[PDB]
Amino acid sequence: ANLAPLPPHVPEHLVFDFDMYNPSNLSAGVQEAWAVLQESNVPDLVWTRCNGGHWIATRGQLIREAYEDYRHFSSECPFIPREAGEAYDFIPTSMDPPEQRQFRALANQVVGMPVVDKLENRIQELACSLIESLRPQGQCNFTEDYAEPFPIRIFMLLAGLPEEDIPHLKYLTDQMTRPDGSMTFAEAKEALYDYLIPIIEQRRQKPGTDAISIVANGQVNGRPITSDEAKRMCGLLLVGGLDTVVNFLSFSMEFLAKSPEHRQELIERPERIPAACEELLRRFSLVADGRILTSDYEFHGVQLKKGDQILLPQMLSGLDERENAAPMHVDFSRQKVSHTTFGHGSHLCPGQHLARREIIVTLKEWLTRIPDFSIAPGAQIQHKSGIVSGVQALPLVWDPATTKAV
Ligand code: HEM
Ligand SMILES: CC1(C)[C@@H]2CC[C@@]1(C)C(=O)C2
Ligand SMILES: [K+]
Ligand SMILES: [K+]
Numbered sequence: 001a002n003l004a005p006l007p008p009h010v011p012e013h014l015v016f017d018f019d020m021y022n023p024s025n026l027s028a029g030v031q032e033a034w035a036v037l038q039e040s041n042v043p044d045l046v047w048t049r050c051n052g053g054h055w056i057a058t059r060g061q062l063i064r065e066a067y068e069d070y071r072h073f074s075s076e077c078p079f080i081p082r083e084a085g086e087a088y089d090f091i092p093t094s095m096d097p098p099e100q101r102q103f104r105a106l107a108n109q110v111v112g113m114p115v116v117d118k119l120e121n122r123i124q125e126l127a128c129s130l131i132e133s134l135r136p137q138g139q140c141n142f143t144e145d146y147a148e149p150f151p152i153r154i155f156m157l158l159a160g161l162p163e164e165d166i167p168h169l170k171y172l173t174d175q176m177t178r179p180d181g182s183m184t185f186a187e188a189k190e191a192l193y194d195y196l197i198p199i200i201e202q203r204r205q206k207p208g209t210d211a212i213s214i215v216a217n218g219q220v221n222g223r224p225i226t227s228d229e230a231k232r233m234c235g236l237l238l239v240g241g242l243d244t245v246v247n248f249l250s251f252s253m254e255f256l257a258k259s260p261e262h263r264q265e266l267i268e269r270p271e272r273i274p275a276a277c278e279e280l281l282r283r284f285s286l287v288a289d290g291r292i293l294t295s296d297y298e299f300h301g302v303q304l305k306k307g308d309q310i311l312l313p314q315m316l317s318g319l320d321e322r323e324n325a326a327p328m329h330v331d332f333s334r335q336k337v338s339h340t341t342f343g344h345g346s347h348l349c350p351g352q353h354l355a356r357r358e359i360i361v362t363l364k365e366w367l368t369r370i371p372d373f374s375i376a377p378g379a380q381i382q383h384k385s386g387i388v389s390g391v392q393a394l395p396l397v398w399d400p401a402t403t404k405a406v
Pocket of ligand 2: 090093177236239240244287288289387388
């Protein structure tokens with residue numbers, strides 16, 4: 001197929017042609033498809049000839065180790081394929097410490113817990129409002145009726161952007177994580193940057209309370225942040241707010257719709273919701289990006305070459321049986337829930353608190369009003385793989401009579 005010729009320094013015995021954008025066992029579930037990389041005879045570190053050719057760490061131990069060693073594993077070129085990785089200049093993700101820190105502080109300021117607290121009521125209100133509106137219908141296309149609008153509307157509120165632009169922005173964001181082939185990562189990035197620039201210059205004048213104004217008026221390296229730097233950071237924020245929680249919610253709801261027993265557990269023991277959120281985050285982890293070698297380096301007996309790209313699937317750590325016994329089994333009472341769903345190292349997701357709030361509010365408010373629901377009859381759920389994996393569609397059904405209003 002589209003396999004790049006094996007490079008001279010890469011041993012043939014370490015070859016495993018995994019395609020992160022279309023894994024072979026996708027029909028069994030995306031997490032299950034990636035899990036093949038953790039089967040008995042698969043090395044801890046393999047090389048796939050797919051997507052231009054790149055390494056793939058398959059165990060949590062290596063993934064964590066690599067994300068900690070930024071001196072060897074630089075985030076300068078974090079995306080596969082290389083062309084996308086080279087065009088990827090988002091801030092602060094494309095930067096390594098010490099350079100990353102000043103920009104990371106600003107990014108954290110606009111999506112951190114203090115912001116979540118400020119938005120507590122908006123988040124709560126939107127969830128209840130959306131659910132109450134769907135409740136009497138007895139059915140919904142979950143991905144588009146809730147998974148997308150709930151977190152996206154909250155983010156647009158946070159960023160101070162008009163909801164009218166959602167279709168446009170969500171489309172561009174997806175092209176950077178799960179390209180449909182209509183455009184390159186670079187074209188999508190430039191389109192998003194072009195959307196943001198006029199807004200940034202517009203707000204760079206007066207101090208605002210929205211994320212874009214705060215970024216545009218930030219101070220980094222003892223100077224005002226430039227409009228271009230603000231652009232590089234805001235683009236990252238847009239992608240982070242429009243294509244992460246959105247997909248995770250669908251993996252979680254798909255699971256709940258297929259498991260009455262787990263729905264009942266949370267209905268009867270609501271105090272377990274926080275823990276359930278964490279276990280779902282482990283089992284349905286969905287991100288996978290990587291790093292690039294800054295110099296020749298021997299890692300776990302494997303000769304990595306400067307310029308080599310290495311995928312470090314955040315998704316795989318928690319599915320690693322070496323980290324969690326019976327990894328594919330969802331156990332809300334699981335002891336020592338281990339995962340790197342939000343990343344590891346200096347780039348550990350600063351938006352994870354907003355994410356957990358949206359997930360926990362969804363679990364609480366959905367089960368409170370629509371405790372009983374199932375996958376539409378005859379429906380077969382399809383997943384999609386990429387930098388961020390997702391659910392193509394999730395048709396749900398329920399008897400309106402069983403629903404409750406608050
Ligand atoms: C379930 C939801 C989420 C998941 C699984 C997730 C996952 C991740 C991961 C794996 C990284 C590190 C990537 C790397 O090391 O290259 C990251 C970075 C980041 N995330 Fe999230 N994220 C989520 C939600 C959010 C939300 C809601 C926002 C925005 C409002 C956000 C904003 C960011 C930002 C700004 C970074 C870059 C941090 C840096 O480079 O220092 N994330 N996220
Ligand atoms: C890997 C990510 C989840 C992280 C935030 C959005 C994302 C797709 C990036 O480009 C950095
Ligand atoms: K070789
Ligand atoms: K780059």
